Swiss-Prot record:
The gene is npr. Extracellular zinc metalloprotease. The lineage of its organism: Bacteria, Bacillati, Bacillota, Bacilli, Bacillales. This is Thermolysin. The active site is at E143, H231 (proton donor). Keywords: Calcium, Hydrolase, Metal-binding, Metalloprotease, Protease, Secreted, Signal, Zinc, Zymogen.
Length: 316
């Protein structure tokens, strides 16, 4: 909408106070004019018609319980925007400052969030398995990263290219988490998962096996469920990514960690310059080695660490 940029205040899903960029025109809308061609957040009002209505508030204060998922979807989209712009010089998900649109209050007791080709969509959870999913910055950035992938490599959402697609989202989801520096970890979804149980999550990058996911190629899932295991076999790549960043010894193979920023630069370069819609795991390894070469040189520690990491997860 047309109006004037203002700054509202509210509380997110976890009860934390934050400022948000809004737009005034009779009401105050969740429309952030400070990033690209705008960040826009919508109310799906418990239904599944999208995007729903642009979020409007009478007083620019967003402390109602119903407000909290909107507050975080809006805020964490901006954090994710900032990550990609400041760290990777990428302007929004298409690289040309496309408007980032999100809808919250999607459906009833909906235990999931997703990018639907055009926008972000967040359920409120059923309150047992999940609370509103926009509460999790890694969830927000994971899903926004699918838009980035769709506009770059375009990894098909099935089998190995699909699992790479998933891993890429968990990797940058995690790096955004660290970027914001609020209780960062290498697990996914912990902030909005099972409010009655502490210490768990949907997935773990550092030990995928903690939630039944493979951490080696020889353990990969090869059935037809989950589009050929995209959220399962992602563990193998996530493991490799963890090892490149933090290092360790996995099934006897030692990896010297190079840190998150370099992991981020190598995988960003791989995603945007070498990967393709049908890339398999072995092709990901080569893209990663080639990217670290570009960035650090053939003889760098960095290149060596990348090869060690993929060796460690059985990917040649
Ligand atoms: Ca209000
Ligand atoms: Ca965390
Ligand atoms: Ca996390
Ligand atoms: Ca939990
Ligand atoms: Zn995903």
């Amino acid at each position: 909408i047309t109006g004037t940029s203002t700054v509202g205040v509210g509380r997110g899903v976890l009860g934390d106070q934050k400022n948000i960029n809004t737009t005034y025109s009779t009401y105050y809308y969740l429309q952030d004019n400070t990033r690209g061609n705008g960040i826009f957040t919508y109310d799906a009002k418990y239904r599944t018609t999208l995007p729903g209505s642009l979020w409007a508030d009478a007083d620019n204060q967003f402390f109602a319980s119903y407000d909290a998922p909107a507050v975080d979807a809006h805020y964490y989209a901006g954090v994710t925007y900032d990550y990609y712009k400041n760290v990777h010089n990428r302007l929004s998900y298409d690289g040309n400052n496309a408007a980032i649109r999100s809808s919250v209050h999607y459906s009833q007791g909906y235990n999931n969030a997703f990018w639907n080709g055009s926008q972000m969509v967040y359920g409120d959870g059923d309150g047992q398995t999940f609370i509103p999913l926009s509460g999790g910055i890694d969830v927000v950035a994971h899903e926004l990263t699918h838009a980035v992938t769709d506009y770059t490599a375009g990894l098909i959402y099935q089998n190995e290219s699909g699992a790479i697609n998933e891993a890429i989202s968990d990797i940058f989801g995690t790096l955004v988490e660290f970027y914001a520096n609020k209780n960062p970890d290498w697990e996914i979804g912990e902030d909005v998962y099972t409010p009655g149980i502490s210490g768990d999550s949907l997935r773990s990058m550092s030990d995928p096996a903690k939630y039944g996911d493979p951490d080696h190629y020889s353990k990969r899932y090869t059935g037809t469920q989950d589009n050929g295991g995209v959220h399962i076999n992602s563990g193998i790549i996530n493991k490799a990514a963890y090892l490149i960043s933090q290092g360790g010894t996995h099934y006897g193979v030692s990896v010297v960690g190079i840190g998150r920023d370099k992991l981020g630069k190598i995988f960003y370069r791989a995603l945007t310059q070498y990967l393709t819609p049908t890339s398999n795991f072995s092709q990901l390894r080569a893209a990663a080695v080639q990217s670290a070469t570009d960035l650090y040189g053939s003889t760098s520690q960095e290149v060596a660490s990348v090869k060690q990491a993929f060796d460690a997860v059985g990917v040649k």
